[PDB]
Symmetry: D3
Subunit: 158 residues, 6 copies
């Protein structure tokens, strides 16, 4: 059984994140969608809310397990018995910072292989930050989020 971890802040999980985790499940036997607490980023949704949103958004994917964590990512991956670390790559700006993280994760856990997947063109220009910015100004974001997440974002900003 090959175990992969897909870590991130997921504040909130978007269709771009769903695209990446779906590609991951077609490649690996078990995928852990791992939500980092990320207090330095001052998230809109609590960790508990982010976990609940992601569980509902991924319930159709049989081999996805949603787990929250506050640990060092590499220690959490070792403790999940993961040997693959999934990250999505949209453009050049992502690439540079992704290299730094991956080289640091390799120093902390050499057997954890970072693998980058590319989202559909449909989600190549979106991010959680961009969707929240549009939604704060009452712009329509239904196209970019799972139905349960869209409802939760509308309710959070109401």
């Amino acid at each position: 059984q090959k175990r992969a971890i897909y870590p991130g802040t997921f504040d909130p999980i978007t269709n771009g994140h769903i695209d990446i985790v779906t590609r991951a499940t077609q490649m690996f036997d078990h995928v852990i969608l791992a939500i980092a607490a990320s207090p330095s980023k001052k998230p809109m949704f609590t960790l508990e809310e982010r976990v609940a949103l992601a569980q509902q958004a991924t319930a159709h994917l049989g081999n996805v397990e949603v787990v929250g964590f506050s640990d060092l990512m590499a220690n959490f991956a070792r403790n999940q018995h993961a040997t693959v670390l999934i990250r999505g790559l949209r453009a050049v700006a992502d690439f540079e910072y992704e290299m730094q993280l991956a080289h640091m994760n390799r120093h902390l856990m050499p057997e954890l292989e970072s693998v980058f997947l590319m989202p559909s063109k449909e989600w190549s220009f979106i991010s959680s930050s961009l969707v929240k910015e549009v939604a704060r100004h009452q712009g329509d974001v239904t196209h970019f989020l799972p139905e349960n997440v869209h409802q939760a974002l509308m309710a959070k900003l109401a």
Copy 2:
């Protein structure tokens, strides 16, 4: 009559912004210089101050109208009857984020065409953030700002 909108935080408006809006007025019949409230950015100048500075800095340009807004940019553009959205492109770092915004604005208002203009080499390495950082340390920024803006920045930091 072709109507273009040039939106931004303009905290404060610089010679780089003046260069872009001047190029815009040579191309389109009416240009709306639209100043976003931008509370998430914690601006140095209030919206009212930014509007007053931009009005004075653009008074020599007959077809420029300066307006403040707190709305979703795309809704403000529809409400101004604008069909062109002007953005300045200085370098690669701008380009990536500009694509995300433009693809989102296209999703929100498909008839609003984003057009990117390139500033003079003279202003290709400056930004409102950089000018404020130099000015906070009492460095000379007279070369980068309209006279009224330079006075206001000196007075604000005095």
Copy 3:
């Protein structure tokens, strides 16, 4: 204002990406000249006469587009055509550094010509005539990226 814009390139062959850009340009400016470079440094797959006929047929539905061939420096042609706008398509995979060099050089050559960068649909943001030709030459399906007349001409060209 009665603006004249130029949209230059090799168009070897014209793709759906080029059609997207020129369509956007026609919604913005009164007259758009789709200008096809006669003698590119790299021998084109299609001759200048073939490239012009394909672009004409593919843009026939756009009333304010004029397809013309040119052999001089793009700024010299723009000046002679009384164009004040230079259309550049900016894909998600474009060499932005080259675009900056080109635009500053074009501004030195003709200051009255303003470079305007337009963004294609996400659908065409990751293609190029170069990539399309390479794939088609290597027996790959490129129908999705081309106007029907171009697809027919490319199959005929690759059959010989």
Copy 4:
């Protein structure tokens, strides 16, 4: 899952950077095909037969690697080989824009083939077969970047 992956390229010659990537791929997937392009647009320094023999010797220690030559479009070969994973090495100096074009085009051609990007060690993150050949041709020491069999073959090739 019994995954089959393809790792395509010119491998002219195979470097320690390529060995690093293919080694990482073998730790992730059940079967890895190191696929060597037969007729690249630019005449290779080593013939296809030389490139295959060097890659075979350099990967002989990896039990789940199969070295094979191919002459079709990389997606057409992947489809015929029943591969569902496409390995791409991402160096700190790679043309990420080109990688995005390639991956979106490969997804159009074969949607069931997933592009996976692997990162080489920092040690090989700033090299390429191109840079290595250019240095070696100009009398520079490249021993550090190549498997021993490749170093011996390159010295013999440059001596003639």
Copy 5:
């Protein structure tokens, strides 16, 4: 005597910074390692702590002088009689912002030449921010910092 300044926040100084300053001392007669107060960045270590850490980490380098400053960088360089400004370049993301700073410093002091040096591959993917993020999660950062700095970071987070 050629005098160079190597300015930065150095919060804290890393092996990457040591690599750059060592290369600088092999090229120029006297190198001033200049630590900016940087209040806008909300540093982990006080200026006094950053100066003490850098002094101890560079004591083996005979021609390095460690000095703290709150002034405009260019005025501090003029006041140190420096004619060279050293900056490290790791990747593309650094390059763009470095150009803006260097063109501004050239406007403020034309005789101060900005020179960029490239660190070893070993330190090409690290930063003070990344090392602090790993250390906040109790990850091992001994490989990336001088011994005195590692101790101080462990003690600060204890």
Copy 6:
């Protein structure tokens, strides 16, 4: 310290961008060798003898510049010249990825040679000898980008 620096390139032809960089290098280092590559992979517009004479005339006012031709690997020449500094000009439009590859490879070849990157004036930050030649060949005005002797030589070269 009595530092010797090398500033290598094709200089085909030397531009105001190159003059800006070498001038900055002379204000920093005791001796600057402007090193002209003899046999570039792409046949140069000007011969090595023409490139040397033009660079000599254009730098005659700088007392600590020595113009010399070289045909070996740039690190092999730097070593033989006892240079410890390698000058690289970094334009706003330079391939930074290539510069990183080059500098890490040069450090592997000669660890005692330190690569130093200098920034040209904003005025020359968007040009290249390549762009200048292409424009001049296509009947464009490039006088602003070149020393007067180079402008005269380029007009004579293009007239034939």
